[PDB]
């Protein structure tokens, strides 16, 4: 039990200590998500841990595009993805939606639009 206690105590040492000093991505540690913090309280032989578990959620079935040609050249983007929410087309992110104008600042160019199947013209 003490080795179990010590394994749990090293777990406990790992959990409250680091579970506060920085973002720590290991699961079963502090949060099933992008870890940021935790808050412990004592108890007669042990501790309590509420975990910070940020979750993106409530998914749908919207649309996105593989690539967009512009003036004969194909675009494969660094950040700013081709998506659509139904009506208007924007450049956005991995996890959510935040539009930007397609510019040379937020888009990078790679290859011509004549070989890849499923390309859309713009």
């Amino acid at each position: 039990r003490a080795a179990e206690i010590r394994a749990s105590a090293n777990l406990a040492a790992t959990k409250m200590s680091e579970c506060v000093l920085g973002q720590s991505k290991r699961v079963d540690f502090c949060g099933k998500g992008y870890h940021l913090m935790s808050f412990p309280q004592s108890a007669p032989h042990g501790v309590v841990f509420l975990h910070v578990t940020y979750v993106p959620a409530q998914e749908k079935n919207f649309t996105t595009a593989p690539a967009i040609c512009h003036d004969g050249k194909a675009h494969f983007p660094r950040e700013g993805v081709f998506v659509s929410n139904g009506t208007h087309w924007f450049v956005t992110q991995r996890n959510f939606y935040e539009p930007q104008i397609i510019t040379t600042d937020n888009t990078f160019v790679s290859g011509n639009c004549d070989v890849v199947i499923g390309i859309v013209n713009n």
Binding site: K32, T53, Y54, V55, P56, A57, Q58, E59, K60, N61, F62, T63, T64, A65, P66, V83, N85, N95, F96, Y97, G118
Partner: peptide, 12 residues
Amino acid sequence: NSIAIPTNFTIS
């Protein structure tokens, strides 16, 4: 060529 976009979160 399809997505699923969260607009809310489920914090547990």
